Amino acid sequence: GRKNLQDSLRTQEVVAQEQKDLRIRQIEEALRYADEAKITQPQIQQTQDVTQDTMFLLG
Amino acid sequence: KWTSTAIITQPDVGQIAGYNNAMNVIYGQAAPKVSDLQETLIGRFSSAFSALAETLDNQEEPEKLTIEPSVKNQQLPLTVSYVGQTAEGAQMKLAQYIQQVDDKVNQELERDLKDNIALGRKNLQDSLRTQEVVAQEQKDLRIRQIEEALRYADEAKITQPQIQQTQDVTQDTMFLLGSDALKSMIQNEATRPLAFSPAYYQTKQTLLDIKNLKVTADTVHVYRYVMKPTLPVRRDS
């Protein structure tokens, strides 16, 4: 069971890394788009946990 | 010449639990039923036992293996008996024959289990492939709406925010976000992350577990020994 569990935790890290890498790509695309739109500044004085779609408000 | 006896009872309930879980995943909604699994295991043994017993009965040899309920001393379950021509031999053969039948069924169960898995791999692989197409199509439509919106915006005379807070909205209203952001999305249309169907991601989770999966079908038994074969002092035939 412990051998299984150690394997499972290992495979799971690989899936996490792939997702982590994909989100970082979406962030790289969002920056060029935000500059292009002419938002190079915060549209809110606040900061919040924010999805890709509403991300642009961060500046 | 000499009758050696052994006493047996029920299946090992625990051992099959993993076979039952796997079977539920593969078959799913269609329903493999619990009932049919009990019938498939019990059937491999039944059919196989009867045949061995059959072969022994027909030959003009005194090698007679029989089953009926009989008493132990403290439990009444099934008593199995074998008549051998030497006492030591009746005890050895009886052990060997119950076991040999255990091995036969376990190999038939392992064999069917393989068959279940192979059917599941064709089905998963085909579903996964189909699911991507529908998602990519739906996506291609949403991209089209982003294009339509841009055209609408350039006519509408809104090229910049009429709404300060960004949100997702359909092509008729989208233009209010402003043309400039819309122009970029179209320009970089290809890189955008691919859309997933609620079914698709589920499929991937299931496949992901399936490769991890542990299951037994070589150490399962269909009987347990209450009394293991003993050396006889009975000269009944």
Place this chain on the structure above:
Amino acid sequence: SDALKSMIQNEATRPLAFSPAYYQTKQTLLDIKNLKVTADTVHVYRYVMKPTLPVRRDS
């Protein structure tokens, strides 16, 4: 007016309004085309007893 003109100018393209029947049609088509079944590993019988000892009589 500005939006309303754009819609008329690009009248042809406009999305299609679809009934529940459309989604049911694609749903049913997708589902038959995946399906697989059994064809030789299916039995409709079980043996309580495997053919046995000939010394019996019947008519």
Place this chain on the structure above:
Amino acid sequence: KWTSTAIITQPDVGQIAGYNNAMNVIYGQAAPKVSDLQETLIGRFSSAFSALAETLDNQE
């Protein structure tokens, strides 16, 4: 001269399940009911088993 016997019982329920589930879910009122699937499988099993026996008796 010498007669062989076998004893049989119910169908293997899990294996037919898919055929029945798919059929009802996809078609609805339009193709066979769970009852009608059942009736049809047995009507077919029963007519064939009996027909082999019938031909066989009639032979001497």
